[PDB]
RNA sequence: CCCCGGAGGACUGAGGGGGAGACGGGUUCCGCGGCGCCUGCAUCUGGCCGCGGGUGACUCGGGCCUAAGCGGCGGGUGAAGACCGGGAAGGGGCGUGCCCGCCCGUCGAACGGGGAGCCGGCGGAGACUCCGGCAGGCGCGGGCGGAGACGCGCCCCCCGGCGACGCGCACGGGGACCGCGGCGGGCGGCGCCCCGGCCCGCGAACGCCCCGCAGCCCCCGGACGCCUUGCGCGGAGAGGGGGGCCCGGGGGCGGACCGCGCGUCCCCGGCCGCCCCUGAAAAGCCGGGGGGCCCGCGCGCCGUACCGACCGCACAGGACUCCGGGGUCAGCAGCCUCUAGCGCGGGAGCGAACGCGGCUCAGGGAAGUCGGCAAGCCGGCUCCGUAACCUCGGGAAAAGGAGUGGCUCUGACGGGGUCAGAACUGGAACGGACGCGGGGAUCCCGACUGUUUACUAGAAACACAGCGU
RNA sequence: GCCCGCCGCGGUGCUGACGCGCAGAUCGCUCGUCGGAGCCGGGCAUGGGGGCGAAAGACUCAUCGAACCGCCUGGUAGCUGG
């Protein structure tokens, strides 16, 4: 959870993602949607596309 | 022919005295004086606090010094709905609001009151336990007496200059939760008195109690004892009008 | 090696004022050093929060300047409380005189 | 003797009811000298012992020699 | 104990001070045959209650 | 996924003390753990601190109330009746 | 010589046969000498005997404060001894003469509260006490800045503060400890290997500057966000931008070798949970409102040695608390160990019965016995698979099965171990010692956790929540 | 006031050892409990026909169906010994 929160926080600050996508993914992380960091980065590409 | 029984040993005190350490003090109404006797005086609720051994909470309330400079601190049994920073009033001209102190003569019939004096100025002794109240029943002006209902349901005449507090005592419902364990009873009575646990008379030897002895546990005679029995004899059911569990009372 | 030490106080009963820490000395030795309890700082008379500006040191060891704040009711009220008192006084004057 | 030769200190027995100020005054007035500091104890037999350090500009060798202590 | 009052210290000190034998010149002077002081005591088998 | 079927918060008691007592405590303990609405704060932040003592965690008022709920039915009725009796004393 | 020395072989095994305190003991402490008594054997040993010695404080404790208590109080009562007690014209400032005032104890804690100490050294026996160095405490003498949050002499009456406080699974930070490498210095062994084994590489109180997460506050402005492992927070003003205060801590300069890690213990922080339980007091010190007005000198009294050398007639009993390394491991378990320490009414020979503590036994398997008493079987970890009944929480580790070593590899998680998989190999072995449930079908009693006949009875007896009078 | 289990606190069975004891109640193995009606230390309170007792007539300094110490007291004995 600390690894996932650190990565999502960095992107929102850099404005790579917006604040609403940030909140949807923050919730999905606390719900055990992602098993590691790589799976999370792929889900970001898909949402962004 | 025996030893002294448990109820005979409690009167001396020793290990049977009340556990009063870390208690906040005695709870009382404000003392009646010139200013309240002629008008009204103002106080502010400073805190609502838990008192050791007591079910209902207490309120620390501050008034001004009426014979000097500074302030004066009082402890009140708290009516339900009282809150920190509230303004309370005490006198012959105080208004009808929860938390105010008024003579029972000036209080309308139908009203809930608490901490009622049975004689004027004694500072309050009736309906003090959590969830209790007294009703004001009627006023008789010529004799200058008021009729009240006590929490047992008995009726009583008191003076009309006896004071009371508007409302009912907070903490109500407390006895509706079962104690689940011996431990909860242990904590509850550790806050009060050395009165627990309880050993039955029939479980003792005849030297310790008049219910003791025998090859089966059993009392042996009737357990209704008369009103004029002496100390050491007055165990069981004292001067009972009737016994047994039957319905249909009122 | 062996770094075990013996008690420094008169008795060994370890109450809350008999706590030590450990430190290495210039002579290559493990020494015990007492850890004082830290007193609280003064709190607001109206709301019970720490007064800003005063260090957590008993006032006997502080100079006079350090023990105070520069405002009416400097060390007694937090400032929100002072504002509330000023407003109460003025507005109640206004509503007691001239209706 | 080590105590007198270095540390410039002399050791006496004194009356148990005597305090450090009384001891300092008495030594000053009797031996015509200057005391610097006084330690004391009561022995396991009940006597009082005084450790008397003289001033940094006085010789305990010399005062103890005039006494006879050497 | 290491933390003792001066009164108990002094009474203990007197017991220690007087726990002694008869001098030999005293034996010669007073013409004694009994030479043991039977008011002596030893810490292992004593019960000084002072 | 739901973890018990019926016992709810009384699952802490295991198999002890019987059915009627556990049934009473489910109700009592739910009531005394609940959050209540602060009659001043405007917000639902009031929690119990002792038997009859309730504090709003936002605006920090303290209030005197029931043993296991903030209001009681006798107090609701009494307050209504006392208010009416006052109003009748205003001519 | 059971004493001392050297060499070897072992043990206690950090909850110590170690290092130190409280209580109790009272000189048992140290040096020199000795063997009459004691040291259930001996002794050249010694807590035994003789002779000399020995415990140093402004900063440690006691003295002070108050806890639960105890005493005292014009008086009250009783044949007294004595016991019981607020209703009493109850004392202070000064400076004449004014002014303020309702009425106790310099009894009760060598663990609670309580101004202030660190390092190095020296002795046969003392040290936070001596000596040297460096500090700290309490005393006595020769009206301004800021926008703001905030920053930079007393005395009386009243309002306040500090002192000053419960428990808990987690999570986070510091300190000490512990490890792995580098580099410097020194050892040991060495039949073969060995840059692979071992030891040493140290920095206090205190003063000045900076730096400090959480948390609380200020300014702008006015909102579908911020954020924790968990939560939590916001028009009663979030986020963003800039600031203030606290923080038992860290760094630099003083005082005066270099990196990188998992974990343990201690203290601290912010939260969250719990209670028919809500978790001392006072001396002392300080703030607010109103009103009136640098250099010198000193710090008195008492304890301080040693000991499980204490109580049990002297003794496998009883006897409170500190500090707590390594390996295996879930581990303060068991087993082995570094540092430190090393008694335990004495030895030799033989290898009968019998006993006491242990071990193994063909074939059968409770036939023994009042009775499976005693003993044995089972046991770690992972996966599979689990019935009747039930107050729906349980029963449950139900019952029953299978795997587990060494070596060579591979994958997953952001330097660190864990988890998963494969090939090879060994008497057909692997929780290889150690540690560590036998299971099931029923009947009677008591609902349950708890309590008891100290020294022949632990239960079906007592208690209990609930119920009733 | 949950379960396995260490120190601690207790004391089930062997009807084991011992029983001229290590000991006027101990030792070995096994066993109950181990976050709570839990365990431990100091100070304080309750005094004998009284106290204290989750109750066994238990405990009250090796003494308890009425402690211990001195006196009344060389108490009386139709009973045993000389
Ligand atoms: K009788
Ligand atoms: K009786
Ligand atoms: K009696
Ligand atoms: K009686
Ligand atoms: K009795
Ligand atoms: K009781
Ligand atoms: K009962
Ligand atoms: K009976
Ligand atoms: K001593
Ligand atoms: K002795
Ligand atoms: K000798
Ligand atoms: K009389
Ligand atoms: K009397
Ligand atoms: K005193
Ligand atoms: K005291
Ligand atoms: K104490
Ligand atoms: K003390
Ligand atoms: K305190
Ligand atoms: K003020
Ligand atoms: K000493
Ligand atoms: K033989
Ligand atoms: K034989
Ligand atoms: K059989
Ligand atoms: K047979
Ligand atoms: K068996
Ligand atoms: K099995
Ligand atoms: K393997
Ligand atoms: K039973
Ligand atoms: K249990
Ligand atoms: K039982
Ligand atoms: K028995
Ligand atoms: K028993
Ligand atoms: K049992
Ligand atoms: K039974
Ligand atoms: K019983
Ligand atoms: K155990
Ligand atoms: K038994
Ligand atoms: K046997
Ligand atoms: K035993
Ligand atoms: K357990
Ligand atoms: K009594
Ligand atoms: K007593
Ligand atoms: K008696
Ligand atoms: K008697
Ligand atoms: K006698
Ligand atoms: K007599
Ligand atoms: K007699
Ligand atoms: K007779
Ligand atoms: K007779
Ligand atoms: K005879
Ligand atoms: Mg019985
Ligand atoms: Mg009777
Ligand atoms: Mg001294
Ligand atoms: Mg060993
Ligand atoms: Mg010696
Ligand atoms: Mg001998
Ligand atoms: Mg001090
Ligand atoms: Mg102290
Ligand atoms: Mg020493
Ligand atoms: Mg305290
Ligand atoms: Mg010492
Ligand atoms: Mg048979
Ligand atoms: Mg039972
Ligand atoms: Mg028994
Ligand atoms: Mg349990
Ligand atoms: Mg258990
Ligand atoms: Mg005769
Ligand atoms: Mg006789």
Automatic annotation (TrEMBL), chain B:
<dbReference type="InterPro" id="IPR008991">
    <property type="entry name" value="Translation_prot_SH3-like_sf"/>
</dbReference>
<dbReference type="GO" id="GO:0002181">
    <property type="term" value="P:cytoplasmic translation"/>
</dbReference>
<dbReference type="InterPro" id="IPR014722">
    <property type="entry name" value="Rib_uL2_dom2"/>
</dbReference>
<dbReference type="GO" id="GO:0003735">
    <property type="term" value="F:structural constituent of ribosome"/>
</dbReference>
<dbReference type="InterPro" id="IPR023672">
    <property type="entry name" value="Ribosomal_uL2_arc_euk"/>
</dbReference>
<feature type="domain" description="Large ribosomal subunit protein uL2 RNA-binding">
    <location>
        <begin position="11"/>
        <end position="90"/>
    </location>
</feature>
<dbReference type="InterPro" id="IPR012340">
    <property type="entry name" value="NA-bd_OB-fold"/>
</dbReference>
<dbReference type="InterPro" id="IPR002171">
    <property type="entry name" value="Ribosomal_uL2"/>
</dbReference>
<feature type="domain" description="Large ribosomal subunit protein uL2 C-terminal">
    <location>
        <begin position="96"/>
        <end position="231"/>
    </location>
</feature>
<dbReference type="InterPro" id="IPR014726">
    <property type="entry name" value="Ribosomal_uL2_dom3"/>
</dbReference>
<comment type="similarity">
    <text>Belongs to the universal ribosomal protein uL2 family.</text>
</comment>
<keyword id="KW-0687">Ribonucleoprotein</keyword>
TrEMBL record, chain D:
<protein>
    <submittedName>
        <fullName>Ribosomal protein L23A</fullName>
    </submittedName>
</protein>
<comment type="similarity">
    <text>Belongs to the universal ribosomal protein uL23 family.</text>
</comment>
Automatic annotation (TrEMBL), chain E:
<dbReference type="GO" id="GO:0003735">
    <property type="term" value="F:structural constituent of ribosome"/>
</dbReference>
<protein>
    <submittedName>
        <fullName>Ribosomal protein L39</fullName>
    </submittedName>
</protein>
<dbReference type="InterPro" id="IPR023626">
    <property type="entry name" value="Ribosomal_eL39_dom_sf"/>
</dbReference>
<dbReference type="Pfam" id="PF00832">
    <property type="entry name" value="Ribosomal_L39"/>
</dbReference>
<dbReference type="GO" id="GO:0006412">
    <property type="term" value="P:translation"/>
</dbReference>
<comment type="similarity">
    <text>Belongs to the eukaryotic ribosomal protein eL39 family.</text>
</comment>
<dbReference type="InterPro" id="IPR000077">
    <property type="entry name" value="Ribosomal_eL39"/>
</dbReference>
<dbReference type="GO" id="GO:0022625">
    <property type="term" value="C:cytosolic large ribosomal subunit"/>
</dbReference>
<keyword id="KW-0689">Ribosomal protein</keyword>
<keyword id="KW-0687">Ribonucleoprotein</keyword>
UniProtKB/TrEMBL annotation, chain F:
<feature type="disulfide bond">
    <location>
        <begin position="41"/>
        <end position="56"/>
    </location>
</feature>
<keyword id="KW-0689">Ribosomal protein</keyword>
<keyword id="KW-0687">Ribonucleoprotein</keyword>
<dbReference type="InterPro" id="IPR050522">
    <property type="entry name" value="Ribosomal_protein_eL43"/>
</dbReference>
<dbReference type="InterPro" id="IPR002674">
    <property type="entry name" value="Ribosomal_eL43"/>
</dbReference>
<dbReference type="GO" id="GO:0022626">
    <property type="term" value="C:cytosolic ribosome"/>
</dbReference>
<feature type="disulfide bond">
    <location>
        <begin position="38"/>
        <end position="59"/>
    </location>
</feature>
<dbReference type="GO" id="GO:1990904">
    <property type="term" value="C:ribonucleoprotein complex"/>
</dbReference>
<feature type="disulfide bond">
    <location>
        <begin position="38"/>
        <end position="56"/>
    </location>
</feature>
<dbReference type="GO" id="GO:0003735">
    <property type="term" value="F:structural constituent of ribosome"/>
</dbReference>
<dbReference type="InterPro" id="IPR011332">
    <property type="entry name" value="Ribosomal_zn-bd"/>
</dbReference>
<comment type="similarity">
    <text>Belongs to the eukaryotic ribosomal protein eL43 family.</text>
</comment>
């Amino acid at each position: 959870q600390r690894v996932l929160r650190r990565l999502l926080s960095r992107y929102r600050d850099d404005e790579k993602i917006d604040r609403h996508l940030y909140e949807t993914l923050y919730a999905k992380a606390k719900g055990n949607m992602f098993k590691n960091k790589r799976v999370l980065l792929e889900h970001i590409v898909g949402m962004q596309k | 022919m025996g030893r002294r029984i448990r109820v005979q040993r409690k009167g001396a005190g020793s290990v049977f005295r009340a556990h009063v350490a870390r208690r906040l003090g005695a709870a009382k109404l404000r003392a009646n004086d010139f200013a309240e006797r002629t008008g009204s005086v103002r106080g502010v609720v400073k805190a609502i606090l838990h008192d050791r051994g007591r079910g209902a909470p207490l309120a620390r309330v501050q008034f001004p010094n009426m014979r000097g400079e500074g302030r004066v601190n009082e402890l009140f049994i708290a009516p339900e709905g009282m809150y920190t920073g509230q303004e309370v009033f005490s006198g012959n001209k105080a208004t009808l609001h929860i938390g105010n102190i008024l003579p029972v003569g000036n209080i309308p019939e139908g009203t809930y009151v608490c901490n009622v004096e049975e004689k004027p100025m004694d500072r309050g002794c009736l309906a003090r336990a959590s969830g209790t109240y007294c009703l004001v029943v009627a006023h008789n002006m010529e004799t200058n007496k008021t009729r009240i209902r006590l929490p047992s349901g008995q009726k009583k005449l008191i003076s009309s200059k006896a004071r009371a507090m508007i409302g009912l005592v907070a903490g109500g419902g407390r006895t509706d939760k079962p104690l689940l364990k011996a431990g909860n009873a242990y904590h509850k009575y550790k806050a009060k008195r050395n009165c627990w646990p309880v050993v039955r008379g029939v479980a003792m030897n005849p030297v310790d109690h008049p219910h003791g002895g025998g090859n089966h546990q059993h009392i042996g005679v009737s357990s209704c004892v008369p009103r004029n029995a002496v100390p050491g004899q007055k165990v069981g059911l004292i001067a009972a009008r009737r016994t047994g569990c039957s319905g249909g009372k009122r | 090696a062996d770094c075990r030490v013996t008690c420094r106080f008169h008795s060994t009963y370890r109450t809350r004022s008999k706590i030590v820490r450990y430190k290495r000395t210039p002579g290559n030795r493990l020494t015990s050093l007492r850890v004082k309890k830290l007193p609280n700082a003064p709190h607001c008379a109206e709301t019970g929060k720490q007064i800003h500006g005063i260090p957590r040191v008993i006032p006997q060891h502080l100079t006079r300047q350090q023990r105070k704040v520069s405002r009416p009711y400097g060390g007694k009220l937090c400032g929100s409380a002072l504002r509330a008192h000023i407003l109460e006084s003025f507005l109640n004057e206004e509503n007691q005189a001239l209706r | 003797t080590t105590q007198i030769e270095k540390n410039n200190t002399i050791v006496f027995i004194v009356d148990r009811r005597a305090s450090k100020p009384e001891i300092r005054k008495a030594f000053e007035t009797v031996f015509e000298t200057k005391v610097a500091r006084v330690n004391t104890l009561i022995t396991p037999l009940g006597l009082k012992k005084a450790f008397i350090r003289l001033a940094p500009d006085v010789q305990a060798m010399d005062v103890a020699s005039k006494m006879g202590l050497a | 104990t290491a933390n003792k009052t001066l009164s108990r210290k002094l009474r203990l000190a007197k017991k220690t001070k007087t726990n002694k034998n008869i001098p030999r010149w005293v034996i010669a002077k007073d013409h004694l045959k009994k030479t043991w002081n039977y008011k002596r005591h030893h810490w292992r088998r004593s019960h000084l209650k002072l | 996924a739901k973890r018990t079927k019926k016992v709810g918060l009384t699952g802490k008691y295991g198999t002890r003390y019987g059915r009627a007592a556990r049934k009473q405590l489910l109700k009592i303990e739910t009531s005394q753990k609940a959050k209540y609405t602060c009659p001043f704060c405007a917000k639902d932040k009031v929690r119990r601190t002792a038997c009859g003592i309730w504090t709003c965690r936002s605006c920090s008022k303290t209030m005197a109330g029931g043993a296991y709920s903030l209001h009681t039915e006798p107090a609701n009725a009494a307050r209504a009746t006392i208010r009416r009796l006052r109003l009748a004393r205003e001519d």
